[PDB]
Each structure stands twice: as C-alpha cells, then as structure tokens.
Design a binder for these strands. Sequence first.
DNA 1: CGTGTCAGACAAG
RNA 2: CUUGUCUGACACG
Lengths: 216, 208
Amino acid sequence: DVLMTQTPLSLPVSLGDQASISCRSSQSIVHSNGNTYLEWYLQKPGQSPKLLIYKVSNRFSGVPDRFSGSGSGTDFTLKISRVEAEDLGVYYCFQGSHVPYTFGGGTKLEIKRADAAPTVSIFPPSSEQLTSGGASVVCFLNNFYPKDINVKWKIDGSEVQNGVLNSWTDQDSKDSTYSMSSTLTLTKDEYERHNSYTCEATHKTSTSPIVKSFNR
Amino acid sequence: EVQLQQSGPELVKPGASVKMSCKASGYTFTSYVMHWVKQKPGQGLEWIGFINLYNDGTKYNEKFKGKATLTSDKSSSTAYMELSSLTSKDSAVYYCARDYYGSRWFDYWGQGTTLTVSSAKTTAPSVYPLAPVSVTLGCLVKGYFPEPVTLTWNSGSLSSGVHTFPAVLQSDLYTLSSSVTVTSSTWPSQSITCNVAHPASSTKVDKK
DNA sequence: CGTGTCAGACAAG
RNA sequence: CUUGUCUGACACG
C-alpha cells in the first residue's frame, strides 16, 4: 500500500506564470519493467477527472507542451507552464505500479488575481415562508478575492453564531472570483421577536467590515 | 468519441445493496478493461478495482472486497458494480474509468453516479423568492432529500451574473440558494423567474 | 512450465 | 502495411 504526498496543497498563480506541483511517493514506484506508471489527473470544478500525463512525463491526447512531467524514483514534479484560467481545479498524481492503485492528496490550483471587494446583498424572509412558520435570512457575498472573508450575524444587536449555513462556490473560470452564501434559519416566533438583522464581511479589500442590515 | 454514461442518482438505506451501470459507446467494449473509482464529496479519489471485460476476471482493492462486485453485460456494452451493506461511509461519487494499458491507469471517465446512503425520506423542496430590502435577486431552495436539484433562470437564459451555491446539509435536509445580478433597468419592468426541478419529488417555477 | 484473449509500445522491411 | 519482438493484465490448461 503506497501513499502519494503532494507538496503544494494550494498554489496561487497569475495567468502567464508556470506552476510546479510536486508529488513524492511513499515507496519506489519503479516497476520491474523499468517503467514508472505515474499519472497526473485534472478535475475541474463540477466535472470528472481527465488524464494529463501518463508515464512520468508522457502527455495524453489533448494536452499541450505547457504540461511536462519530470522526476523519477520517489520524487515527481508536474510543470504547468503558461498557466491559463481554464486550468483551475485540483491535480492528482496516480501510481499504477503496485498492488493497490493509490492517488495523492490533490492540489488546488488558484488563479492569482487583483484584490476584489464582495458585493454583499441581504434578503429578508419571504412572505410565503413566513406563513409556513419559517423565516430564513440569506446573505450574499459575490465576486471577491482572495477567499479570506469572515461573515458575522447579529440579531437585535448581539452576535448570533447559531443556526448559520455558509456555502462556498468554486473559483469562477471567467471572473476568477469567489462567492459565498450565508443564511440564518430561524422561526417565525423567533424572527418577529427582533427588529434589526445584519451580516458582516471582513476582507483584505476593506479596512472596515462591510455591513448590511434592515429593520422590518 | 469514446463516451462512458453511468446510471443516475441513488438513495439507498443503510443495510442494503445497490448496482451501478456504465454504458460504453464509440469503441469495442470488450477490448479495454474497465476501472472504478470512489471520491467522497469534497475529498480525494480512491481506486476500487478493474474487471477484464473479455473474461470477466476481476481484481479489487483489498479494502473493497466484500463491498464491491464488478460484473458486466458484454452484449449491451454496459458495465455494472454492486455495493452491499451500504453505510454512510459509502455515500460518495463513483466513477467508471476505462483502462489505458495493462489495467494500471485510466484515460476516460464517466460523468459519475452520486450515491446517497441514508434512511431519510424524500422531501420536496420549497422555493422562496428573494426581494431586495443594478440590483441582485435570489432563489431559495430549502428542505429537500435526496440530491439533486436543478435551479435555472429564465428556462436556462440569464446564465451570466448568476451564482448557484452548492447545497448544504442540516438535519437530514438540504438547502440551496442562487443569486442573480441584473441591470437596474430590468427588475421593476422585466421579470426574473426561478426554475427549480427536483427530479425525485417535484418541479416548481415562480417569478419575483 | 505452458495456452488463449486484450490492448500499448517498439525496430526494421 | 509486413516481419521480429517488448510489456502489463485476466482467463484457462
């Protein structure tokens, strides 16, 4: 049972630049053939993996010369030159050498971009859900970067880190930005007992937290 | 033109078995050995095993012996996989990848079947409009089992400026939201309609 | 020890 | 395309 470690866990790169993702193995992957069966696989968001390199350096049908593979024995490197935006996603190294075929941990290639500020949008509960004894306050934070943002919720002036759902989408292929969604699911009785609701976002792109609020 | 089509989604209860399909088209289904992989949502991949479609000789990952069973119907160009004694630890996405050489690594992959192991029952979603306090609207899909849901705007149009956030799980229920940013010239005059279609229970459509 | 199927590679005529 | 092979897998004897 051979394990595959990938040195770069996350790798932020700007378009044009090249990225070096290394994948050291637990044991020797050199089969008796003298051949090393080390692969590299790319899994773009919302899609199943695709083969890129298939010996240690052999490129599969579809990949340009930008992708090259090096390293033999136990240390292996994947070189992605002239990085593009359609190169988002995690990269796995796979060994088809010994008894159980095993992948690595993965590596999330992040496209390095200018700093962006979120577009915080808040929405009060729907009149339809309010009749159903429910009241969900949804907060939207879209088109920002880096992915380092913190969302807070207050109720009538008190931090409420209770019953909060946060949803993170992948990095946009075009925008190269992230978007978050927090929602505060309360009850109708619990909701109408308070007047002021807020969701805050603290980001590198703002010296002060982005505050949105309403009072019904 | 080698394509690989798997069966659709599956919610089975803890304790039972399930069989998955992998249809192959564009090549000799009996030539290339089939491979199966498992990837829990948000995690890495894991090789399961491969079956020699010419002799039906199977080779498994010893940690998968007793869980998986690779068979096929060589005439229908369909490859199967069986998972017995399902547990929450098995709820993941299972791909079927064709073998490139020596039944060692893979070249082509299927879209992936999403297996859900849970005793919870199928609950239809509840769509709620998101009116403001350019402008941004929203569509809230709350309380549903099992995944998946399809949320689209204007019957597929308005693909730009739309963010479909992945669903979150809470108390055996799902909740999915999607925001849409449009020119200010539209919402008071032009309408944005949300389209939710949960293939397991219902399909709802409501304007803003 | 051997035999068959299957593919992916090769050097040379 | 033909010849001489190399290689991994599975089945079988």
